[PDB]
């Protein structure tokens, strides 16, 4: 029906089947399709997620236009997603003037000023991590990183965001811990979404929420207790409540929505990435040692890390940066074109979803040498300059980039510094080498990362 | 020529003489003209500063529209002022997109976060004040407040904004001190401006600057030394340099311009107001004692004040608030209407300067009882609620309000707490009672405030 679009424009792509579009091509997962598409077709191509035209662009002047130059005018929202229900107000979801309000009202949550105030707390759980890690290191049992990293990152969220302090590895079943741990695209549901996006309004009317209709009701209330327990008697909720004291302040259920996408991401990104990094440290043993040295020449005597010294560790930075090059958990960035528009000499008509294929661009040999080896020296202050910030985009770019970037980078670095101060990480046999990525829809490993840990 | 405007609109006012407009009416100073005009004419009137129509509005729904609701759309800039030269870029001066850039790029200079970081410094000079005050208190010589307060506030600026630490009362002639101390409306010049505003372009072409063409050249350079002396080896300049590291960063001479209007205001407002307050404490002896008690029940043993406890002193707040009611150093707020527009049912045509007569409204019996007595209980948490924030406007309102409000309130409170911890202030004979305001163009006293100081 609407499949003629790129045939007209003179824009190339894979021919789309009726109804499906090009979705059968995701049997290899988004990343492989993107990569293949980049090389078969070059710098611009089109496909159809159902009847939804998606235009993939790989020019960094053009990417800059979409992510930064013309964000407010044309390319302000991401792809409609559903059913959400009361999570329509979550910032990552919200659109246009509702977004801009929330982004403003939630921006100073992550300033150098407030990020630095959170450092002492994100400390006390790095220590909890060591002790939970040493019990697995004096008992030579290979360690599922995501698990031990998960509970750590989880401990950081509840703390950085509500107060609630839990040894979540130890209290894996505390009511605040169950809820919070709780399929995403490429699975039985969202493929149907993309083929039956007309069926989304069906469920919105049904209180059916992708976020299960129960985890929400736990934290909706648990907040308005906390709300009514410190009021009256440092974290994200606190920082959000003071802000509803221009625009229109912050409504009550809008607060619970932003908390949820804060609890995710702080959990699943931070812990997912720390395992990609630790897998990389194990499989490239020289880098781990180089880092363990710098960690120690800044913080001698296994010294506890601080704000200013974490930004002082450069090899630490380069390692994180390079792990994210190889695993940009986002994979793609996306904005809905809201007007007939022409950027850098190309007509983009209304409603086209515009897509930047991060994962593919991070592995493009046209910009990276040996792009699949793990080469942390790419990010040296010698070579960091020669890197197009519109090709390397692990946090997006522009006014709709990741709001948690600074906190995310600091969360993970405070982990590694503590964790590399006391242990070293060797591979095991059941350790997956080389790591295989999930054929699914998420930048996650086929098999969880298991490594051997050793006390120093 | 253009004097028919309010005669048409059906808007009332004093009939304007040719060329002059209504300026001869300023022989009683703006405030008295505003007050008289409010009572002769009511809620809306017009006059002509030369050929410049000025519409004075006293309705707080309408004031809110002009200062907050429609700031960005219609009422975004203040009255053209000149000649300025390179001070065209100073934020208080700049217009529209240049302003909004600078206001954004200079906003997080004054956050709770950064304001709190400045508290320890604004301390060490409160102490310098005591010792400079005790030399005048063990030597019973009546004290010119503006002088001792001036050097204090001056000490705070150079410190809060560059580093340079001077005992300016002691070093009254240090090169950084002379410059920085350096007629404003109602004097031989600006009256000619308002009658010959066509002659402003004349001087702009002449490097003639109201800011003398020399003080600027001192600080322009003194900065690019400091710029090139900490780079590389907490204050306003530092906070401004890190910010040029969306929009278009911060250009180099734009930095010097914002520094100048920072050095003023931090000097002349802070010290001007502290003398209005201390004059008031002397002439109303009961309030001074009430305050000296609360200052001591928060900070016992002449304890040094801190951030959180300054916001804890409520009678301190009420006193400042009420002094500003009686002396709003601004007197008037103003915005240039940039479109034919209709707010709250009144046509305002392009180019009309829109004026809110703060001083008059703070003394309006229609909103204030005994509005001229000094009654600090007006601002009690019992009665503070019954106060239209669009009548009481010592810092303006809305997106173009005073950016230094929080710092100003905290600067002055840290002064009074220290100064009232060690001294009490009695009037003298040559002390002007009742204070007379300058017939001139500035909210300043006819005669400087002299009081008797006594050690405790
Ligand atoms: C390694 C950690 C993380 C990575 C790689 C990451 C990556 C991203 C990316 C690529 C985007 C979209 C950028 C764009 O569209 O241009 C994004 C958005 C976002 N991220 Fe993160 N993120 C991380 C962690 C976090 C954390 C800890 C938070 C904390 C709450 C957070 C909050 C958000 C939000 C709210 C958005 C939506 C931005 C918006 O739509 O306004 N992220 N993230
Ligand atoms: C008792 C102290 C002060 C009072 C009563 C005061 C009052 C005001 C008022 C009424 C305005 C205009 C508001 C409006 O147009 O709606 C203003 C503007 C401004 N004030 Fe203050 N002010 C004070 C101190 C300061 C201080 C210490 C600074 C520090 C640098 C400062 C910086 C500014 C700036 C930059 C503007 C221009 C705002 C703009 O045009 O964007 N002020 N002040
Ligand atoms: C942004 C549109 C409207 C197109 O659809 C999405 O909302 N997005 C998708 C689906 S639900 C996003 C939500 N997830 C979440 C999942 C379970 C429980 C609670 C929340 C979210 O905001 N998590 C924050 C986050 C995650 C990763 C990195 N940083 C921040 C997922 C998504 C993939 N990458 C993103 C980048 C930004 C925003 C969303 C996503
Ligand atoms: C705002 C327009 C463009 C209409 O003309 C002015 O720029 N304004 C007038 C004249 S020069 C403003 C400048 N003074 C200054 C004087 C000598 C040396 C350096 C700077 C300024 O910005 N000082 C900051 C300030 C002063 C008082 C309270 N807070 C902040 C003066 C003026 C009276 N009340 C204001 C309120 C806001 C901005 C300016 C003024």
From Swiss-Prot, chains A, B:
Effect of residue 147 to H: In allele CYP3A4*10
Impact reported for residue 188 to R: In allele CYP3A4*5
Reported effect, residue 253 to P: In allele CYP3A4*18; exhibits higher turnover numbers for testosterone and chlorpyrifos
Pathway(s) it belongs to: Steroid hormone biosynthesis; Cofactor metabolism; retinol metabolism; Steroid metabolism; cholesterol metabolism; Lipid metabolism; fatty acid metabolism
CDD domains for this protein: CYP3A
Regulation: Activated by cytochrome b5.
Catalytic EC class: oxidoreductase
Cell compartments where the protein resides: Endoplasmic reticulum membrane; Microsome membrane
Reported effect, residue 323 to M: In allele CYP3A4*11; unstable form
One Gene Ontology term, aspect cellular component: intracellular membrane-bounded organelle
UniProt keyword annotation of Phosphoprotein present: no
Post-translational modification: Polyubiquitinated in the presence of AMFR and UBE2G1 and also STUB1/CHIP and UBE2D1 (in vitro).
Keyword Cell inner membrane annotated: no
Cofactor: heme
Inducing factors: By drugs, such as rifampicin.
SUPFAM superfamilies the record matches: Cytochrome P450 (SSF48264)
Any single GO BP term: estrogen metabolic process
Chief site of localization: endoplasmic reticulum
Catalyzed reactions per annotation: an organic molecule + reduced [NADPH--hemoprotein reductase] + O2 = an alcohol + oxidized [NADPH--hemoprotein reductase] + H2O + H(+); 17beta-estradiol + reduced [NADPH--hemoprotein reductase] + O2 = 2-hydroxy-17beta-estradiol + oxidized [NADPH--hemoprotein reductase] + H2O + H(+); 17beta-estradiol + reduced [NADPH--hemoprotein reductase] + O2 = 4-hydroxy-17beta-estradiol + oxidized [NADPH--hemoprotein reductase] + H2O + H(+); 17beta-estradiol + reduced [NADPH--hemoprotein reductase] + O2 = 16alpha,17beta-estriol + oxidized [NADPH--hemoprotein reductase] + H2O + H(+)
Assembly information from the UniProt record: Interacts with PGRMC1; the interaction requires PGRMC1 homodimerization.
PANTHER family found in the cross-reference section: CYTOCHROME P450 3A4, CYTOCHROME P450 FAMILY 3
Functional summary from the UniProt entry: A cytochrome P450 monooxygenase involved in the metabolism of sterols, steroid hormones, retinoids and fatty acids. Mechanistically, uses molecular oxygen inserting one oxygen atom into a substrate, and reducing the second into a water molecule, with two electrons provided by NADPH via cytochrome P450 reductase (NADPH--hemoprotein reductase). Catalyzes the hydroxylation of carbon-hydrogen bonds.
Miscellaneous comment in the UniProt entry for this protein: Chimeric transcripts, characterized by CYP3A43 exon 1 joined at canonical splice sites to distinct sets of CYP3A4 exons, have been detected. All are possibly produced by trans-splicing. The chimeric transcripts exist in 3 different combinations: CYP3A43 exon 1 joined in frame to CYP3A4 exons 2-13, CYP3A43 exon 1 joined in frame to CYP3A4 exons 4-13 and CYP3A43 exon 1 joined in frame to CYP3A4 exon 7-13. The longest chimeric isoform (CYP3A43 exon 1 joined to CYP3A4 exons 2-13) exhibits 6-beta-hydroxylase activity, while a shorter isoform (CYP3A43 exon 1 joined to CYP3A4 exons 4-13) does not.
Record protein name field: Cytochrome P450 3A4
Organism: Homo sapiens
Gene name of the record: CYP3A4
